[PDB]
Design a protein around this ligand. Structure first.
Ligand SMILES: CCCCCCCC/C=C\CCCCCCCC(=O)O
Length: 257
């Protein structure tokens, strides 16, 4: 019954709003710097960076550890969103951990696209805007940490998804079932099928003119996988080049290679 799929879409959108303080709709109102009620301060070099906390260790490391704390906060938000996905908390506890362990970064890069345009990325809840060129000029091991996310984002953002689309989509991601180590794949897959059914109807109704958006969105889930592996490879390099630099445990636990 399609009525039950709209109810599910509505439930997930509502819970997405409640779980994620900075939505795509807000991010776009800020980036399209004409709804000029709170425009961001723009960090594009190191002096602007120093004026940054005049409004909002080494600089590459300092930025890296700020991005690190923001991912920790993002994991907390995604985890709270996951508990609202119907059936998720009824799954075996080990599979809950495993679904979050693998789904969390794919979601993070999906949502981080909402905060990006080709030029840069919103930061500090939207108060700031760090330019892509600045991040790309960062010292050696760090300058290329964000570029593949920007590359994904400019293409993903071309789908023109809105938050109500994304709420279903990140739910689909969490409930994969092809994750390594899942103890009971079948109840996961049944939840995902209902989610997939809900996404499909949602894209049909929300984007009637956008041909095969559902297929094209599902195909973006391979871009996400590659971002993750590239990232964990980049982390291993940092763990050995800077043995003085601490990684948050929540993020350490998520990263089991
Ligand atoms: C430092 C985070 C401030 C607390 C709330 C943050 C709200 C979410 C938005 C941006 C987080 C700030 C990111 C800090 C610099 C890293 C750049 C990045 O990769 O996003």
């Amino acid at each position: 019954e399609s009525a039950d799929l709209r109810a599910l879409a509505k439930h997930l959108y509502d819970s997405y709003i409640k779980s994620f303080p900075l939505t795509k709709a807000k991010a776009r109102a800020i980036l399209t710097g004409k709804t000029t009620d709170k425009s961001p301060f723009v960090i594009y070099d190191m002096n602007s960076l120093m004026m940054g906390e005049d409004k909002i260790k080494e600089v590459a490391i300092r930025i890296f550890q700020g991005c690190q704390f923001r991912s920790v906060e993002a994991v907390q938000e995604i985890t709270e969103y996951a508990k609202s996905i119907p059936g998720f908390v009824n799954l075996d506890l080990n599979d809950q951990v495993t679904l979050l362990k693998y789904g969390v970064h794919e979601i993070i890069y999906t949502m981080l696209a909402s905060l990006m345009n080709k030029d840069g990325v919103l930061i500090s809840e939207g108060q700031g805007f760090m330019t892509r060129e600045f991040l790309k000029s960062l010292r050696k091991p760090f300058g290329d940490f964000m570029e593949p996310k920007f590359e994904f984002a400019v293409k993903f953002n071309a789908l023109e998804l809105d938050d109500s689309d994304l709420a279903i989509f990140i739910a689909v991601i969490i409930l994969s079932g092809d994750r390594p180590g899942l103890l009971n794949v079948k109840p996961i897959e049944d939840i995902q099928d209902n989610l997939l059914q809900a996404l499909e109807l949602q894209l049909k109704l929300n984007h009637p003119e956008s041909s095969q958006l559902f297929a094209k969105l599902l195909q973006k889930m391979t871009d996400l996988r590659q971002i993750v592996t590239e990232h964990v490879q980049l982390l291993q390099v940092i763990k050995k080049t800077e043995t003085d630099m601490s990684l948050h445990p929540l993020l350490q636990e998520i990263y089991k290679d």
